[PDB]
Coordinates of C-alpha atoms and ligand atoms in Angstrom, one line a residue:
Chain A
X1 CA 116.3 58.4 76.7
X2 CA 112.4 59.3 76.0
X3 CA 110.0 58.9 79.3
X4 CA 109.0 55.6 79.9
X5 CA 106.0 54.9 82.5
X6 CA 107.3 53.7 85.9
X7 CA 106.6 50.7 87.4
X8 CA 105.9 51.1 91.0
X9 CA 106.2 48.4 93.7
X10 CA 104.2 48.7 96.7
X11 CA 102.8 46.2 99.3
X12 CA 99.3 45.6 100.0
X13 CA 99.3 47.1 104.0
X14 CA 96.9 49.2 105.6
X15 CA 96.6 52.0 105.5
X16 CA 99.5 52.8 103.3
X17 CA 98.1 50.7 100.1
X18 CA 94.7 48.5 100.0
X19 CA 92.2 47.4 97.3
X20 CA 89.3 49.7 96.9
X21 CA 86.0 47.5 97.7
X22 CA 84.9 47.9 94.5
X23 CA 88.6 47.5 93.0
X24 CA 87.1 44.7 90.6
X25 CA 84.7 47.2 88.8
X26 CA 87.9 49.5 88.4
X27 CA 90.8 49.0 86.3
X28 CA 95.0 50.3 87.1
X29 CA 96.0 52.7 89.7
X30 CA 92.1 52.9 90.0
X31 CA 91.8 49.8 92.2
X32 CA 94.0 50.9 95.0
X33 CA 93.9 53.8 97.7
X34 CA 95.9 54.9 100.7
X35 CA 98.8 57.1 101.9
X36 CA 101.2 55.4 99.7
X37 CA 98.4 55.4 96.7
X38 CA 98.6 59.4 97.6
X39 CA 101.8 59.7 97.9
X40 CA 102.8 57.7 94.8
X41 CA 100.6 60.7 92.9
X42 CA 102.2 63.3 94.4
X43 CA 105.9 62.3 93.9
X44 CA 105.0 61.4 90.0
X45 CA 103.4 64.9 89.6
X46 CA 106.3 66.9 91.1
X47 CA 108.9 64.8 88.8
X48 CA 106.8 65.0 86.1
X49 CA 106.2 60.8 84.8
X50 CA 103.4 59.0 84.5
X51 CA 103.1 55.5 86.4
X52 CA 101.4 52.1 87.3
X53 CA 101.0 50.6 90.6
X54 CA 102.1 47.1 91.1
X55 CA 101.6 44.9 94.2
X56 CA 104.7 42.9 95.2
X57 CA 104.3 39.6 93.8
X58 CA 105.4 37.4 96.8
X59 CA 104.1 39.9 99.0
X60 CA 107.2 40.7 101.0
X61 CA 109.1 43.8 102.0
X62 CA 112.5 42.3 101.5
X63 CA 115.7 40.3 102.4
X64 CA 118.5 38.3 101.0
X65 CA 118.8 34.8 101.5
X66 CA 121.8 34.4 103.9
X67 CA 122.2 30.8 101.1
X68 CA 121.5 32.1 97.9
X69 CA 122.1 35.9 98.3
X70 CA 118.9 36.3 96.4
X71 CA 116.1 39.6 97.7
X72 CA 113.0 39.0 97.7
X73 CA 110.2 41.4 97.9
X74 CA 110.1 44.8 96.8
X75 CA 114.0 44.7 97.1
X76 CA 114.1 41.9 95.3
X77 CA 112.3 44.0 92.4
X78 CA 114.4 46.8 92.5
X79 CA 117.2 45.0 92.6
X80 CA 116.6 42.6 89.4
X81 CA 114.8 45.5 87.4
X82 CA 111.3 44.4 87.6
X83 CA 110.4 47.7 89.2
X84 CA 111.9 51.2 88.5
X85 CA 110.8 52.5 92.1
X86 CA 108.9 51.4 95.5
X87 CA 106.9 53.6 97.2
X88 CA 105.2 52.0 100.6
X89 CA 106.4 51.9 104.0
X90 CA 109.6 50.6 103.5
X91 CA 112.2 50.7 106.3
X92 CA 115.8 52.6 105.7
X93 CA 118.4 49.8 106.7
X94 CA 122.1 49.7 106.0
X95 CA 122.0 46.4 104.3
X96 CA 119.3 47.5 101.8
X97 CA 121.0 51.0 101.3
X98 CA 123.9 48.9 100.3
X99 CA 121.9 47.3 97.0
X100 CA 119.2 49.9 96.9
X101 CA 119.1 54.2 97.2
X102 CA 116.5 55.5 99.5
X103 CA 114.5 58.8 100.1
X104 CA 115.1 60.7 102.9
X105 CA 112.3 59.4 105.3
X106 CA 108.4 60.3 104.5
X107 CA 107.9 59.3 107.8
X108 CA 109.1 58.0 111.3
X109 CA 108.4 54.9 113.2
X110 CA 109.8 52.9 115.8
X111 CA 109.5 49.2 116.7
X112 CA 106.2 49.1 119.4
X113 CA 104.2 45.9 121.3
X114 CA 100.6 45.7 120.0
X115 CA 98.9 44.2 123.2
X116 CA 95.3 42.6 123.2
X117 CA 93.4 44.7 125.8
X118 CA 94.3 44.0 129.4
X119 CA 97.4 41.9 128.6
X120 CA 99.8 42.3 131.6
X121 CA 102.4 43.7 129.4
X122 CA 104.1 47.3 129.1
X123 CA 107.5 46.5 127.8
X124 CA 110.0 44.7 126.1
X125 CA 111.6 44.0 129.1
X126 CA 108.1 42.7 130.6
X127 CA 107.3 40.4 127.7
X128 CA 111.6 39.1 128.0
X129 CA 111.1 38.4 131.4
X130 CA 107.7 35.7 131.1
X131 CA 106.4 32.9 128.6
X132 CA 103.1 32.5 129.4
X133 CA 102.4 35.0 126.6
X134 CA 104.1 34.2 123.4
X135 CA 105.4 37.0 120.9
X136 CA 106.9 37.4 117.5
X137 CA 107.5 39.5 114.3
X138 CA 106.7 39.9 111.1
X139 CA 108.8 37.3 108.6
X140 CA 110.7 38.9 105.7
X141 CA 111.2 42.7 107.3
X142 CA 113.5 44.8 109.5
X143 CA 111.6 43.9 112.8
X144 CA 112.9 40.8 112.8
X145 CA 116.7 41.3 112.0
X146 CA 116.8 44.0 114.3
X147 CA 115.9 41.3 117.1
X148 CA 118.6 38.9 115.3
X149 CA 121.0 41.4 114.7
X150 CA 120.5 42.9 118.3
X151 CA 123.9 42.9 120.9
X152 CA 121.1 44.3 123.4
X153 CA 120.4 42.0 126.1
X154 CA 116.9 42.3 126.2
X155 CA 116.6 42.1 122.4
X156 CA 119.4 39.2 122.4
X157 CA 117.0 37.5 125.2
X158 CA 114.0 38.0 123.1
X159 CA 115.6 37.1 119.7
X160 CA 116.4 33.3 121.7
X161 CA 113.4 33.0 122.8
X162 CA 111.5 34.2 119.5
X163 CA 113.7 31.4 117.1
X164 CA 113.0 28.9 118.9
X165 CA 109.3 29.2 119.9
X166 CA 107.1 26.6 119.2
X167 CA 105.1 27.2 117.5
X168 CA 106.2 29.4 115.4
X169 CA 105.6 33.3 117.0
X170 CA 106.3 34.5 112.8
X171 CA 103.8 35.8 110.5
X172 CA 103.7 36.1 106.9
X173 CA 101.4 39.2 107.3
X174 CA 101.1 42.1 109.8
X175 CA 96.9 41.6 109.1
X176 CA 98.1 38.0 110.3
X177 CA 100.0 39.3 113.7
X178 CA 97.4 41.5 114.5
X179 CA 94.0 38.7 113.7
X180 CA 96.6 36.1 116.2
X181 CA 96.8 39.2 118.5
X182 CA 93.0 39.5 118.6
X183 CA 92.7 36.2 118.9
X184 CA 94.9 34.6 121.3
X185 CA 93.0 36.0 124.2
X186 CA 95.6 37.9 125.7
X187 CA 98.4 35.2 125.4
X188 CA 100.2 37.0 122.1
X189 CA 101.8 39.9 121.6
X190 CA 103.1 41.5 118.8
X191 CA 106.2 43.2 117.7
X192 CA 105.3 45.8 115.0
X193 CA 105.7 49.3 113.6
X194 CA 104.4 52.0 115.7
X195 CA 102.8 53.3 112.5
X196 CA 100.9 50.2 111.6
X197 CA 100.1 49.7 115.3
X198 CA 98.8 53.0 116.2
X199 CA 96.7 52.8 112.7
X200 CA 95.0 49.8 114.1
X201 CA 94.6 51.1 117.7
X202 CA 92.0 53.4 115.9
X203 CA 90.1 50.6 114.2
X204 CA 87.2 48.4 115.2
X205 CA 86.8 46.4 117.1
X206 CA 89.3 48.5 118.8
X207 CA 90.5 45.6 120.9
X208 CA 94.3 46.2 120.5
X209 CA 96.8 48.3 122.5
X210 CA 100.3 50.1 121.6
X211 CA 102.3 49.7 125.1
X212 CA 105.9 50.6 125.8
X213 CA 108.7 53.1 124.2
X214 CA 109.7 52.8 121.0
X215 CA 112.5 50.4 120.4
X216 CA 114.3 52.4 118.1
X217 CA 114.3 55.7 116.0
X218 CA 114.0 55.0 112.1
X219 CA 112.2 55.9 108.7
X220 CA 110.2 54.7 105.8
X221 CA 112.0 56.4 102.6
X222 CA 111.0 56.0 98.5
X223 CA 113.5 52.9 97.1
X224 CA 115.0 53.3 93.8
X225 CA 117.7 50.8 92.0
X226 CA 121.1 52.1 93.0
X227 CA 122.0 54.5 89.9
X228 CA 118.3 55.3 88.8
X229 CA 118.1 58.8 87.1
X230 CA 114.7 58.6 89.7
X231 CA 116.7 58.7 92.9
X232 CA 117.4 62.3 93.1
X233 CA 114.3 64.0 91.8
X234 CA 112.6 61.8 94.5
X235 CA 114.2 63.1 97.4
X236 CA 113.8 66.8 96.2
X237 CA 110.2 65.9 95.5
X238 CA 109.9 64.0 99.0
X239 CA 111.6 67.1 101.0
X240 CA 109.2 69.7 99.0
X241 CA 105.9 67.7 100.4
X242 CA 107.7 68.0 103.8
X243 CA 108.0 71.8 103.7
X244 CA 104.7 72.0 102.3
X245 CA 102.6 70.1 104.8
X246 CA 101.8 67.6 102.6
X247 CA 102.9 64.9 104.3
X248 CA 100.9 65.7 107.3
X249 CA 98.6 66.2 105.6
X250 CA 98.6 62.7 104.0
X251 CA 99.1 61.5 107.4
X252 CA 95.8 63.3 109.1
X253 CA 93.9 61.9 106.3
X254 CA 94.7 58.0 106.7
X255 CA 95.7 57.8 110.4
X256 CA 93.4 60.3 112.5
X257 CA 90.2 60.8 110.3
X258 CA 90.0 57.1 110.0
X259 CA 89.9 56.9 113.2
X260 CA 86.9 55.0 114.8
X261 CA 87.7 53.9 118.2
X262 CA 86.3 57.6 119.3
X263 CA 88.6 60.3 119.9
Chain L
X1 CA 144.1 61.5 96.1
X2 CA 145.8 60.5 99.3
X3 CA 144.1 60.8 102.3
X4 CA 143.9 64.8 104.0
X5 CA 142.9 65.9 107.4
X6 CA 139.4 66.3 107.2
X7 CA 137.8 70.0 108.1
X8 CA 134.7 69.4 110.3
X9 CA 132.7 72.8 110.2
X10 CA 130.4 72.9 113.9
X11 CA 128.2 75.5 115.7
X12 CA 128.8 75.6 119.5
X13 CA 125.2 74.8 120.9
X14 CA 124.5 72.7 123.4
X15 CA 124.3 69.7 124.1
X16 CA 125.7 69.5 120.6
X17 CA 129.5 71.3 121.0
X18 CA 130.7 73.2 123.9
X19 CA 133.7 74.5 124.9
X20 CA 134.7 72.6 127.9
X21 CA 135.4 74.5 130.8
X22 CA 138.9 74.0 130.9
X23 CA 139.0 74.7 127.1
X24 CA 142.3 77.4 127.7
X25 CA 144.1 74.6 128.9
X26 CA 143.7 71.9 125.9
X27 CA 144.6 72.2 122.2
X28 CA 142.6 70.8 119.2
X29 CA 139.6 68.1 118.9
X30 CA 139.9 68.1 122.6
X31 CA 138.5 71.3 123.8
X32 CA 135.3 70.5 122.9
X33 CA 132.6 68.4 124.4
X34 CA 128.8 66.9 123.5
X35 CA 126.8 65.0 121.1
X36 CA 128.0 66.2 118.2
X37 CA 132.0 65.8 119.5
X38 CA 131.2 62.1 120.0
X39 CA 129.5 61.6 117.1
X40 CA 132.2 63.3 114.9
X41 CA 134.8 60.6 116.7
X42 CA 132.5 57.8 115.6
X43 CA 132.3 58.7 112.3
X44 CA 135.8 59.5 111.6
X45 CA 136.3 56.2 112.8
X46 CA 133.9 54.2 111.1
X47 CA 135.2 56.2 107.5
X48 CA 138.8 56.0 108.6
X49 CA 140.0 59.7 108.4
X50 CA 141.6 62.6 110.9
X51 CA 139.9 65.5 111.2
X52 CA 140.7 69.1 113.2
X53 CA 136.9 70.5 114.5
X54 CA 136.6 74.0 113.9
X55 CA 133.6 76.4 115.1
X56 CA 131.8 78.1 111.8
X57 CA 133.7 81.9 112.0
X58 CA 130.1 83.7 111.9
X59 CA 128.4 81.4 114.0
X60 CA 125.2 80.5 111.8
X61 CA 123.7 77.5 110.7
X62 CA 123.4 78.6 107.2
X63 CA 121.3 81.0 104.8
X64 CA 121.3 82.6 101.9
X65 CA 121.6 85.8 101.3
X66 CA 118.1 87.0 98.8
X67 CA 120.3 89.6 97.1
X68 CA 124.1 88.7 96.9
X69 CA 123.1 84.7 97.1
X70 CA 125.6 84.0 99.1
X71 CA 125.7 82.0 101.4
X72 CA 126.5 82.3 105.0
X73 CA 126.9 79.7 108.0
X74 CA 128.3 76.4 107.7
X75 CA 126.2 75.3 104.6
X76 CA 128.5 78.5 103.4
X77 CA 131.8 76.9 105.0
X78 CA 130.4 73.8 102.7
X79 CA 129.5 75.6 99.4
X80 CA 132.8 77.9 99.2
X81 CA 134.8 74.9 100.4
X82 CA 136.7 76.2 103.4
X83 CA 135.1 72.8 105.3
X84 CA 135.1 68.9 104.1
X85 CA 132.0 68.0 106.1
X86 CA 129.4 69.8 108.5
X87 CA 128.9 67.5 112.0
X88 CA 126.4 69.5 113.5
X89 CA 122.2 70.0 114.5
X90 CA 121.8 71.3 110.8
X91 CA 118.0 70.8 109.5
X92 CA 117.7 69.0 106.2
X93 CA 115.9 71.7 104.1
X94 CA 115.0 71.9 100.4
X95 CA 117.0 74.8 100.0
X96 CA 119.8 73.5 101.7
X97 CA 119.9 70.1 100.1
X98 CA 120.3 71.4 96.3
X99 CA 123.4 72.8 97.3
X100 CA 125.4 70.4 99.4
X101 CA 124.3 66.5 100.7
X102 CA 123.1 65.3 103.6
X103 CA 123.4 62.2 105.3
X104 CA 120.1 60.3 106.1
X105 CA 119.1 61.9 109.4
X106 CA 120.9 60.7 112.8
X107 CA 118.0 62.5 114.8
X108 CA 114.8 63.8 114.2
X109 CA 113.2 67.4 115.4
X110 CA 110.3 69.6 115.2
X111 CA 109.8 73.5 115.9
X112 CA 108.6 74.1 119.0
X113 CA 107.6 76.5 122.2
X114 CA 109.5 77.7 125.0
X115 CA 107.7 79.3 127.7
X116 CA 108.7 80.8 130.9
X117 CA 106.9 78.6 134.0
X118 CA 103.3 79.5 134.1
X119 CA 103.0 81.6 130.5
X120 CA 99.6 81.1 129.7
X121 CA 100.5 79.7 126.2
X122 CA 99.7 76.1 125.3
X123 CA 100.2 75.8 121.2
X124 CA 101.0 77.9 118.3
X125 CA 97.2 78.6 117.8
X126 CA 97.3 80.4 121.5
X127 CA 100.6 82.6 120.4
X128 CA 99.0 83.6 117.1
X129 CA 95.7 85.0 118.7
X130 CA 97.3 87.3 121.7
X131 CA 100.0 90.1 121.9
X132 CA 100.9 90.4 125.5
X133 CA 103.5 87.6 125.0
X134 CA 106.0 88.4 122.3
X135 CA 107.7 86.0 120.4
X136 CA 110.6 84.9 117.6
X137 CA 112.8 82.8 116.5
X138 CA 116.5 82.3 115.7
X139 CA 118.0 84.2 113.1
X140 CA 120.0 83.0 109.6
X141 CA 118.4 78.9 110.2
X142 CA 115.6 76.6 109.4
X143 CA 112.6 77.7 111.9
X144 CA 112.9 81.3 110.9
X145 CA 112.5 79.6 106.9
X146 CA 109.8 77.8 107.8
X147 CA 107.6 80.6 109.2
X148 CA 108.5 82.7 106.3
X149 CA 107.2 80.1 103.5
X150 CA 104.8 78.7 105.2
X151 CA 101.1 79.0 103.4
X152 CA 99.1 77.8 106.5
X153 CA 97.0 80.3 108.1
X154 CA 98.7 80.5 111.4
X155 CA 102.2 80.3 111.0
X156 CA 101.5 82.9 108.3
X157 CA 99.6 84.8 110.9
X158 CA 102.2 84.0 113.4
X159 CA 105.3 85.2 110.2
X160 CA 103.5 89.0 110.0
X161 CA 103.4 89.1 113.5
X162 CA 107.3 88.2 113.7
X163 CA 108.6 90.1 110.8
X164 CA 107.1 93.6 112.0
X165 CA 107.4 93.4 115.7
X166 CA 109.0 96.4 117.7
X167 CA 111.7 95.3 119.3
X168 CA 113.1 92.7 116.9
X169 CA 112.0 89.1 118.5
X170 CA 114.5 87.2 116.4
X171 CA 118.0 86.5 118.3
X172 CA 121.3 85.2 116.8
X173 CA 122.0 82.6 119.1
X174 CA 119.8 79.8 121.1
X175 CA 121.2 80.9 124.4
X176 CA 120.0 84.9 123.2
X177 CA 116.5 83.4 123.3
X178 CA 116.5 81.3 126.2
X179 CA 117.5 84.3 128.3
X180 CA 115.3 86.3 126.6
X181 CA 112.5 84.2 127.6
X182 CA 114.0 83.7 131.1
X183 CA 114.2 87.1 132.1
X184 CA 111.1 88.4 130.4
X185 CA 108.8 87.8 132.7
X186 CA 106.4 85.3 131.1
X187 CA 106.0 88.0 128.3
X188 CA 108.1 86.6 125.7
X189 CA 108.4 82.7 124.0
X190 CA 110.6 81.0 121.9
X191 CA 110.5 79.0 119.1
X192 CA 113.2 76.7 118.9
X193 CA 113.6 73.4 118.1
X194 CA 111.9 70.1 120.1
X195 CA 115.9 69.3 120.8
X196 CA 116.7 71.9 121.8
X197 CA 114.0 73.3 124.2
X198 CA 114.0 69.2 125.5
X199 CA 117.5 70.0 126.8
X200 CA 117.3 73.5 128.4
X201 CA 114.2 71.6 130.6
X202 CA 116.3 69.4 132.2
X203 CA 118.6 72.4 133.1
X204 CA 118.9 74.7 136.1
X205 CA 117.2 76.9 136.7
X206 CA 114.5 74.5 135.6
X207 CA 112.3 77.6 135.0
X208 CA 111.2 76.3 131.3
X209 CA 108.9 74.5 129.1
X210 CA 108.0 72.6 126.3
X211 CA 104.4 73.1 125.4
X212 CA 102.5 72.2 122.5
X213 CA 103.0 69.4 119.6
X214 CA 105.7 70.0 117.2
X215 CA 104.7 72.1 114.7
X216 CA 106.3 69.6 111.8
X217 CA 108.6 66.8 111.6
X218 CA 112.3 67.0 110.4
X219 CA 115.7 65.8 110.7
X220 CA 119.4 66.8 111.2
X221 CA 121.9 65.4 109.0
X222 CA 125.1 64.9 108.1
X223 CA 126.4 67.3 105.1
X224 CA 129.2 67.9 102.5
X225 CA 130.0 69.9 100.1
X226 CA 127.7 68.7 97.1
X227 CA 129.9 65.5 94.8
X228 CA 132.2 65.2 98.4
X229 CA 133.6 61.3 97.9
X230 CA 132.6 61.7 101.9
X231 CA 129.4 62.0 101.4
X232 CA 128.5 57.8 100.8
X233 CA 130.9 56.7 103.4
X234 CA 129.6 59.4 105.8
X235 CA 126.1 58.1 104.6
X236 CA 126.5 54.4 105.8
X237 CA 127.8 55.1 109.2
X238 CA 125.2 57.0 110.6
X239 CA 123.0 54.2 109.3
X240 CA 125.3 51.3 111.2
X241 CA 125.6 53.8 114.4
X242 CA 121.5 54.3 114.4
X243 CA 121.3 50.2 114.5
X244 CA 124.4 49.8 116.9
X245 CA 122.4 51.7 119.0
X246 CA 125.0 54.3 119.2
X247 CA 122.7 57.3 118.4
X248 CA 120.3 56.5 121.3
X249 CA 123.5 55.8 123.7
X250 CA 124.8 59.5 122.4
X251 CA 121.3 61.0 122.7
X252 CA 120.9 59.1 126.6
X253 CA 124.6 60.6 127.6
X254 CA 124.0 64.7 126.5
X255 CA 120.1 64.6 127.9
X256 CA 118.7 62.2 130.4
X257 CA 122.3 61.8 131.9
X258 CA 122.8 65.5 131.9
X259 CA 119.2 65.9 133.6
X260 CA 119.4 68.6 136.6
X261 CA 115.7 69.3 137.2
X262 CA 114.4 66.2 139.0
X263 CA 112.9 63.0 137.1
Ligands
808_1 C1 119.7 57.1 110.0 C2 118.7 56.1 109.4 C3 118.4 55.0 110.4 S1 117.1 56.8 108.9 O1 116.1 55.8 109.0 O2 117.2 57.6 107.7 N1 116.9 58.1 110.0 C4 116.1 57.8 111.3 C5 116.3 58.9 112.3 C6 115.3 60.0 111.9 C7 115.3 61.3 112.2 C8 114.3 62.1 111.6 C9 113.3 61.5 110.8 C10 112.2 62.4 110.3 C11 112.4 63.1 109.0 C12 111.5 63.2 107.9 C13 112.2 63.9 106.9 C14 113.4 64.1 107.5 C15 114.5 64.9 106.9 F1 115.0 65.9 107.6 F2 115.6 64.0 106.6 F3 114.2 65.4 105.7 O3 113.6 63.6 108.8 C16 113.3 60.2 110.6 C17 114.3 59.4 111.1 C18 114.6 57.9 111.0
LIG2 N1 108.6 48.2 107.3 C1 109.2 46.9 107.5 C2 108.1 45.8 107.5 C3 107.4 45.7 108.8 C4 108.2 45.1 109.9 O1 109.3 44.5 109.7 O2 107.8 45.2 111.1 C5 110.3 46.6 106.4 O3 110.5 47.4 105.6 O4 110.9 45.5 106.4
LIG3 N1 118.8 73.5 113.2 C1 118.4 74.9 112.7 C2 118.9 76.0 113.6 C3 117.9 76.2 114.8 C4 116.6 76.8 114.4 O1 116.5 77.4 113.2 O2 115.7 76.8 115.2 C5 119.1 75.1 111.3 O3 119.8 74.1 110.8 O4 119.0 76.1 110.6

């Protein structure tokens, strides 16, 4: 029927969507800013709808409950109609594809080891191979079942090991990973995004290091419900700020010219 | 309806398809050898079909035609329905997309620039502010597209250039420009894409290279005729291969493993 404003899920993760430090003196879409704030204009201009931003209410990306076969997160949202679309850095997997229609990817990443500085570390195969420095994943996401899904011996070995840690090597937050990261002196590592990681490379107190190959090839893409008149439109509007260097663009802007760990 | 042998439109570039050496002395699926071969087996597999591979009869990717609007290639073979499904290094492109469906991509890509050892050509910038060394692209596909459209000031410098140089500097096949730029002398690079020239470096003579970064960031998928019941099932697989690891294994065997010019 008639145009209805979309509600937008997104997750509060730099530097894809954060509060504005003034965000209290500012009201709506107002509040926020980042490359999925951006990006969130550009899509609803080039479809041609009007929109509010909404942060995820339990703060998750998403997963079903192996028990209930409830999602949770932004999935969740989709999924139970509380949200029309999600637009953040949401990883393309088969099992949400299944319950959820994604965007061709906005951008890549790959699962990287954030290092403190001068941890003795360079791979996944260094960190499966020791214990005197612990190392985990983000709860909730598709870091972590690609470790529990993994047939991969070293990603099998690290999965055991990562279960079973005491105490726990899972965060709630990546801000969470990277402040026990900074913190541990060394003696954590963490398993994260090579987009978040190399974002936080570049900021102070530039203490953190990206180390290793990528541990796999995928892509963040714009979630709609499965069905959603949204989904197509999207995906044109997604490969159109491709072609047009927008997306670059977007990513110059919140990765490099933020940086300020020098050049 | 019941179940029909499935017609797989393919280019023959490598690694992608080639024609064995032996190809006079096999019949069918079996003459044919490389990424793009093993990946069609895995996906036939995984979506439970036959299929008979058959090289696209003008040997394009696919472009249309500004007058007739026809198109030509195997997006052609696609649109007019003589082939069920395109397994191939076919470029997700606007254009493209709002006339058949693509998969999610099963491996990224960005143009790129092949010199002869020792051209004294680092980027695109370099190319676009000298005239000694000439330089093209591929004919009928998506690098020649994106130099055309392209609004940025050096790729639109580099696109007048192209378009009006004496001789032509656009080829019709990879393998054209690759000996092209091998027998020129240093005075000629091509433009190809990051796949591509990645390969040809790790081949004899091991007298090319790779310079520069990427000049954007794109993907090669899967693609059907536009409404293909394929197109879903095709959809999932690649997804399931890309976390089977499959897609990494595939990419390993046709490059590293094929690696003839040292480490
Ligand atoms: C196959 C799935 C795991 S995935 O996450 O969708 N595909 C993975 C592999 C890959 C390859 C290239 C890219 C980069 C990219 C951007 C835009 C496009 C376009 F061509 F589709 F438009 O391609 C991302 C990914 C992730
Ligand atoms: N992008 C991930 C969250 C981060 C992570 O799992 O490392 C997801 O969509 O689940
Ligand atoms: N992959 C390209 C062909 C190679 C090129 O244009 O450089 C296409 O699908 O058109």
């Amino acid at each position: 029927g008639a145009n209805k404003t979309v509600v937008v899920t997104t997750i509060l993760e730099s530097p894809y969507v954060m509060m504005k430090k003034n965000h209290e003196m500012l009201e709506g879409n107002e509040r926020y800013e980042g490359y999925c704030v951006d990006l969130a204009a550009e899509i609803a201009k080039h479809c041609g709808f009007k929109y509010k931003l909404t942060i995820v209410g339990d703060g998750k990306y998403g997963a079903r409950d192996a028990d209930t076969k409830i999602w949770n997160g932004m999935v969740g949202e989709l999924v139970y109609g509380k949200a029309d679309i999600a637009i953040a850095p949401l990883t393309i997997t088969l099992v949400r594809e299944e319950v959820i229609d994604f965007s061709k990817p906005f951008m890549s990443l790959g699962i990287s080891i954030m290092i403190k500085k001068g941890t003795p570390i360079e791979s996944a195969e260094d960190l499966s191979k020791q214990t005197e420095i612990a190392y985990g994943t983000l709860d909730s996401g598709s870091t972590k079942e690609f470790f529990r899904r993994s047939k991969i011996a070293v990603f099998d070995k690290m999965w055991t090991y990562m279960r079973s840690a005491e105490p726990s090597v899972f965060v709630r937050t990546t801000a969470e990973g990277v402040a026990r990261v900074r913190k541990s002196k060394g003696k954590y590592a963490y398993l994260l995004e090579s987009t978040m990681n190399e974002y936080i490379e570049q900021r102070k107190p530039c203490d953190t290091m990206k180390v290793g190959g990528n541990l796999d090839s995928k892509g963040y893409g714009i979630a709609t419900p499965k069905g959603s008149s949204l989904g197509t439109p999207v995906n044109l509007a997604v490969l159109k700020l491709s072609e047009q260097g927008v997306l670059d663009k977007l990513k110059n802007k919140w990765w490099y010219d933020k940086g300020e760990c020098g050049a």
